[PDB]
Amino acid sequence: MRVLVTGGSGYIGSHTCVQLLQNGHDVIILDNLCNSKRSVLPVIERLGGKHPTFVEGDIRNEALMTEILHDHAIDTVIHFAGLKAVGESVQKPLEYYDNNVNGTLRLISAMRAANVKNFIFSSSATVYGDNPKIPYVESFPTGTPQSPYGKSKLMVEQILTDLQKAQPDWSIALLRYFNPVGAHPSGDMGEDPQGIPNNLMPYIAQVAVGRRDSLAIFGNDYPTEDGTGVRDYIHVMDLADGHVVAMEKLANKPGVHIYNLGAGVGNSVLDVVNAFSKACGKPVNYHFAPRREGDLPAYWADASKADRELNWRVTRTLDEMAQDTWHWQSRHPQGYPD
């Protein structure tokens, strides 16, 4: 199929693009480069084994979106583009709402204009809000995200839902991601955050590479087995694979298809640290700090639905997640070149 991948040069999108190309689809990447570099493109094509077309631009530019859609005869759109720094979203809400809410709105508006009716959206477990019931299941009603980022994600899910209702021929997949980590097995592609990493894995990696002193473990008094926070980590490659499958199986299948994409099990901060220490051959330095604002104690996904309906499940392990990250970090300590 002909697919437009917004945010295609980013972490998750890049890996998805590679998997998409491997499956012989025709890929058009649309990215504004606010959080990625052009230097990833050649890697995508190399690892993907096929050339993806790249367009530098913004999802907020409806006219351009419409043009691309028509120009490339797109069949389906995978929408990864947007801003995702939780803390920053609290400090700069408007940017979040603009890029995520308006951004998606402009994009689907262009789709309507170009008669494109297959969409895949990068959603988040954040949409479940403060749910005491875990694991999280797609049948649970959504709650109230605590950050503007989280809220922006739920708002889009809602707008998408109403759109489908009004344009019942659309097939829209709401893919709720858990905690993506890992890197391509080659070690030549991976997450390349700029500045201080907000997420656990990359932070650990940076500590391991010798860039940072010690990992601050946010909280050690949680009602969990070891006192640290518990989450569902999923290898970016599994996530990527899930996207391809969802795209292939849901295209032209009318409805709003919601799926949690996670491993279906939780691991604590310590579990993650331990796996990394093992992967990098040295104990990762760390210390306990106070709980981080808005952090939930423990949650993970119930990924039965995706298994059942899409025959998709993760296949990479936590160790792999850690090994792959280390390999990329270690092979490319400066990330992608300017």
Added chain:
Amino acid sequence: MRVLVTGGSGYIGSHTCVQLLQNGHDVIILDNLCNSKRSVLPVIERLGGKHPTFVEGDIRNEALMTEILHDHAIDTVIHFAGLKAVGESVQKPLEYYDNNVNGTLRLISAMRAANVKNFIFSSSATVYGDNPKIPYVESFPTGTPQSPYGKSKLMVEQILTDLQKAQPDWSIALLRYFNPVGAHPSGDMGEDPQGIPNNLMPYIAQVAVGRRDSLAIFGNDYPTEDGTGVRDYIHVMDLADGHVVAMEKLANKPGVHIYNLGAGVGNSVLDVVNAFSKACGKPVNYHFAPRREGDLPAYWADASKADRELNWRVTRTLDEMAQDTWHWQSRHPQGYPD
């Protein structure tokens, strides 16, 4: 004060403008005329007793918004502009999200740019969602609106809230309206809907004027005193007055000030019909029809807070609401001239 009134040529905004001018404020009206006519302007100035400046344009045009803000040294913005047809919102969701969500977003973004930090937003009781507890009180957590229109209103309330948190110097009033009806006492200004009126009062008026046959009373088996739906109707003039007061008292008072604006009592469909029959001197024709999709049985506002904090309460009666509407309808059967 210097105030920008978006949607100023519309139903609620026009009346507010008149009251604003009467209080000697400097008014700049910004409206795209998608749901009003220029012919109201002269009436506003006449009844307002002072000239308001008019700018034809769209809230979605951030650059223009910014310009107006700076050009007129605006101190505070009253935001009435947007789309409000509930049923249509279900059929055309994107337009609602664009005009309301993005629309407001562009506007407050311009405000930020122009350093304007006092805002008043036209909200709705819809934000309470399906609340069994009535009357509705500002302390209740919001629920889930059933239409894209309702959702759009709640989304903005949320975006506004996060914005204030990030820009704590802002004063933002979330004015939750109930069911606005009535017209200026002169009978020369009032609601001028195009096509089939979606709301009760104007529909009744059109039946009374001889334009329509009979009023369809949506449902007669509700768990109410007479079986018909119960709502809190508030005279547009009271609503207008509330806006002036809120503007004057909350300006430069940091925070998110939420107030329900309603009479604080409910009236059924029959109560309304009866008042109108009385006002127009003839029995209004009507019949019972099935319940309308998404209609709640009964609700009204608890308006104690606004009384307490702003010393504001309604002063017009239901009879007045009906009389005033009839007078306008009867004096201007074709509404405002093209």
